[PDB]
Design a binder for this molecule. Structure first.
Ligand SMILES: Cc1ncc(COP(=O)(O)O)c(CN[C@@H]2CONC2=O)c1O
Ligand SMILES: Cc1ncc(COP(=O)(O)O)c(CN[C@@H]2CONC2=O)c1O
Lengths: 364, 375
């Protein structure tokens, strides 16, 4: 069944476990947006979306029009929100495929409106508020409020939602986070007061869902925690029990007498050469990767008395002491990036009840 | 029509230039193997293969059965050599798709042979030498050569240090190969294709041509190191990683930017947000990330996010949303620069370009083709 030497194993059971533990945090009326941008953080957006439609979630979020359309082309019917920039070249496609667009200027809204009029159907949009991230969004001021009342009047636009995003909600002190929330509440209250109707207000990411049970509003945005990982070591982990879903695996391709094992995974699979202390798990024991990581393979020193043969399974992360977090720490980056590094040629294989149920090649 | 906010622009003209300058190094009868593993080092294996069939090259090389089969599924007819490991689970598919397999041992050759027998057609194989270069290996090879449903077509080794200043070790490896080559010549064994040279060797070692050379990094317009003889071979990089300015704003003094608010403004600043992030392969690890906009270099500020970055515009330029941003492949922003910042190599920076980044191909300064790996 598996014909590639190196694959990403995704445990669908663990995803369900994570989602259900997330849902147990939430009250009945609070909506869940499943964040599945960057191919569901490396796990496979189409498949993870299929699971989310089954488990019933209220919205899907992506980072790009094309990620949105890929989901549509694969049968997905859930509302999809592009969280970021939509270039003008992609408005038509967004509207035709019912992808909800993030909007953060009146100019953008007006051009979208012309296209939606042109096509003779409404564009659904969510307004972004820059509450403290300084990334995307309207500033939280009197000027933005009027610009929003204005864009709300554009026939051929359904101003459905409004959101902001926290820059430091995974840190110990939530001061800045609540400072951001207040900037949002400013816009929320002024628009409430201006008779502008916004069905979906949302602000909470994974960190906020966990640590800030007062920031639920109409909906929350669950990303990293869906996949079985914490946004940091500083969040209240005891609130939510998680199982990581991804195991990055290869096979022992060669053995040689030190005993050196050659494994057919390299930096072009996302096992980055930058790692200063690369390690692997084999038959429950951790071993050093030795010499430079190559494009398509690495050499590992077996310095323990284990019976090991060509074909035996190697785990790069997702089990025992070899974790995406460990690699991230070695890199000086974050688990998010390690997950997203898994490259195109790495087949995603999905497990369920300990059976392989599906294998996706991104080449064939 | 480009509809993605972030793309990898591949200049086909430059690829042709590189290949032709490579061909000018080579004598009439020496074959070229175009190394296009890892999706042609991020440039697009299918398209680069199409170009190579057009420009005529002898052979294609890949790192994985599936890379080989992807090329076949897209009409490619050139010989393809899997340079790396073929698991037993993939022998059948290799043979059925005429993917030439690298072999290291008699035992592997014999199993392949059974499958080829089973399928009633020959497997094409190339022998790899570290097969120790001793008398034992030479008989083992004369043995495998006999096996009926295998075509022992070629034999090769690969240099570990040919891009360094001193090749001593390289010529040490070459000798070990020449031992095997001469003993098999002397036995009855044919070997139509003997090859050893990678990009570094093609450049610095004009005596290691044999029947064929393996051109990789150089094809794409990059040098395997700073130590090779660059003056022998003029290269034009083929790839430009680009995005668009997605948002632009004037930010007050002392305001934090991005996760952890690790950059705070030091006066009023113009901040451009660009829709490229670490999940497009613009790694967050970079300590000094930069971008080129309207010919000027700018600092990326605050943490690089999954899907976007913040850029301080501190020069009097006229920039509007939609304007073009270059992450590398032009002027001072190069894959090599990023590699050096990271403590890795240009090879890795090229290969980091992720699936969602559309490859768009240019030719005479016109867009001729756009490939989405999502749609
Ligand atoms: C607008 C927005 N909402 C929700 C999320 C989900 O966050 P969690 O995954 O922490 O729940 C992200 C993630 N943005 C990624 C996370 O890291 N860097 C980024 O840009 C985001 O940009
Ligand atoms: C067997 C073999 N031959 C030829 C090449 C071509 O190398 P150049 O790109 O230098 O021409 C490679 C690339 N191997 C890559 C280069 O860096 N690390 C690797 O594992 C290879 O593995």
């Amino acid at each position: 069944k598996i014909t590639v030497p190196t694959w990403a194993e995704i445990n669908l059971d663990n995803l369900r476990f994570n989602l259900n533990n997330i849902k147990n945090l939430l009250e009945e009326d609070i909506k869940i947006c499943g964040v599945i941008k960057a191919d569901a953080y490396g796990h496979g957006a189409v498949e993870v979306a299929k699971l989310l439609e089954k488990e019933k979630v209220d919205y899907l979020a992506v980072a790009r029009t094309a990620e949105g359309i890929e989901l549509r082309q694969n049968g997905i019917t859930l509302p999809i929100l592009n969280l970021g920039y939509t270039p003008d070249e992609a408005f038509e496609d967004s509207i035709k495929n019912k992808i909800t667009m993030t909007v953060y200027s009146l100019e953008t809204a007006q051009k979208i409106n012309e296209i939606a009029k042109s096509l003779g159907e409404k564009a659904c949009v969510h307004v972004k508020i820059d509450s403290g991230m300084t990334r995307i969004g309207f500033q939280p001021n009197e000027e933005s409020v009027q610009e929003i009342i204005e864009l709300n009047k554009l026939e051929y636009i359904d101003l459905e939602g409004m959101f902001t995003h926290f820059a430091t909600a995974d840190e110990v002190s939530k001061e800045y986070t609540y400072k951001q929330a207040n900037n949002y509440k400013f816009m929320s209250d002024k628009l409430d007061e201006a008779g502008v109707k916004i069905a979906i207000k949302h602000v909470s990411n994974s960190a906020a869902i966990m640590d800030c049970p007062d920031l639920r509003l109409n909906m929350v945005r669950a990303g990293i925690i869906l996949y079985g990982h914490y946004p940091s070591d500083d969040v209240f982990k005891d609130r939510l029990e998680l199982r990581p879903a991804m195991k990055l695996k290869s096979k022992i391709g060669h053995i040689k007498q030190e005993t050196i094992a050659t494994v057919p995974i390299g930096y072009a699979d996302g096992f980055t050469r930058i790692q200063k202390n690369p390690k692997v798990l084999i038959k429950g024991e951790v071993f050093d990767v030795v010499g430079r990581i190559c494009m398509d393979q690495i050499m590992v020193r077996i310095d323990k008395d284990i019976d090991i043969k060509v074909g035996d399974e190697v785990i790069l992360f997702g089990e025992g002491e070899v974790t995406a977090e460990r690699i991230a720490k070695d890199l000086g980056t974050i688990n998010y990036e390690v997950l997203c590094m898994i490259s195109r040629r790495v087949d995603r294989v999905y497990m369920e009840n300990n059976e392989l149920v599906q294998i996706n090649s991104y080449l064939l």
